[PDB]
Design a protein around this ligand. Sequence first.
Ligand SMILES: O=C(O)C1=C[C@@H](O)[C@@H](O)[C@H](O)C1
Ligand SMILES: O=C(O)C1=C[C@@H](O)[C@@H](O)[C@H](O)C1
Ligand SMILES: [Zn+2]
Ligand SMILES: [Zn+2]
Ligand SMILES: [Zn+2]
Lengths: 251, 251
Amino acid sequence: KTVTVRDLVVGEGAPKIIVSLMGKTITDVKSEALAYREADFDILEWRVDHFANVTTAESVLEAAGAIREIITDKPLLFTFRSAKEGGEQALTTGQYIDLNRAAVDSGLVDMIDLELFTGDDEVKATVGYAHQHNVAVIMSNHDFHKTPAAEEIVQRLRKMQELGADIPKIAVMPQTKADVLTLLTATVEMQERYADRPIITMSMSKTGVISRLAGEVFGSAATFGAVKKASAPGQISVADLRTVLTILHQA
Amino acid sequence: KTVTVRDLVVGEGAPKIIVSLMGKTITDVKSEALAYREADFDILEWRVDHFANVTTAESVLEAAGAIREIITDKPLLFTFRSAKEGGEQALTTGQYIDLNRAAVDSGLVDMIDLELFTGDDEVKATVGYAHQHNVAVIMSNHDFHKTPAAEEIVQRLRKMQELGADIPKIAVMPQTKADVLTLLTATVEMQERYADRPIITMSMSKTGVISRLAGEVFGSAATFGAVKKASAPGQISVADLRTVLTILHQA
Ligand SMILES: O=C(O)C1=C[C@@H](O)[C@@H](O)[C@H](O)C1
Ligand SMILES: O=C(O)C1=C[C@@H](O)[C@@H](O)[C@H](O)C1
Ligand SMILES: [Zn+2]
Ligand SMILES: [Zn+2]
Ligand SMILES: [Zn+2]
């Protein structure tokens, strides 16, 4: 029901805060890490798609090591967000899978992100590989154009569980206020019908910001905040995020 | 359309904060007003149903005057909540109308609360009477045990507009998380399709707390908070409420 990554217990208490580190070079990654020591979050997501030398394994490994040397007490989530799903760069399926396998091999990351629509066989294999190294998997899906029907959102989260995700995650784009409620409904329905582990959901953009602030009642276990710049539309500053989460938790 | 009550413009910007004052005697009322004086809220609601011998109009008017002497810069809302709607006591329809008209006549109150289910003839005439004296009307309905279907919530809010309410208000109790989303759905449908004035909606208890915070995005113009140290589930202190409402407004 819960997922423990280094003493952090996800799926219990107030929603956990994830922030994304985005750096093009190892120098930028180190500088950003140093700046992120001055923020209050629970999980550090390294957005590897922002890293220019992603196709050079040694460079990626060096950067992950550098982050770990600076940010020593926060779980590290390795995420290459594909351009197909709103990220900064496209890779072939093989390159993407091999990149995540290399992250797992490094022993420097606590979690990897795998995109649900990468391919079932590849996802299953990579989940197994991660698990044999005690690395957790956040499985992800995005719709940057619309909000699918609640039932479709629920079935995608359910499939993520079937594929072995430790934490299913979905982000959708509202076109109307009603779409924000559709995302919250899907979160509630997934919780009561299928979830046997934590899930993360969000409705993007300013229109959907309430979904990033109210996950405790509806069933989203974590939420993203912005340190200096948002890594997806709709994130608010991390200190304000903790403030709201705490107020709601004690309400 | 907005509703202006002494400089306060309801229906524009972040939702407004209403606090409720309860006292049995003029001494209780003075003590509470002194305690509330420095708190950060927008409208002071006096819950007259908690006051003793309300059928003695003169004692009620003396208490209203006492409040106005202490709280000089906040709009004052006069609310007799009937027992049938979760209040402390009952009055005949005639006594209730006379009490509210006496409040209008005093010049001490900026708004009165009229319950939708009081009866159409009496309500509409008293709305006219209040308007004749430049007193705004919040028309209210409450269900402390359950949440009506979204369609019924919308119907009630539409009827309040039809009867001439300046601000339709509904508060309902969720039994499930889905009930909270039902209340938000009704708020969105009402505000986007039928509303031509500010509306106030709320889902009670801790489960419904989102409804006190998301007024700007779903269409509720005000929320209720606590001044008092000790509060109830779902009720947020006014300082914390202002903090969250501002964070959402500035997101
Ligand atoms: O909606 C969000 O806040 C995000 C979703 C994921 O794609 C993350 O990888 C991204 O960095 C932030
Ligand atoms: O739940 C609350 O905090 C309240 C809501 C409104 O009905 C107010 O009229 C009532 O006095 C208190
Ligand atoms: Zn190995
Ligand atoms: Zn007159
Ligand atoms: Zn009942």
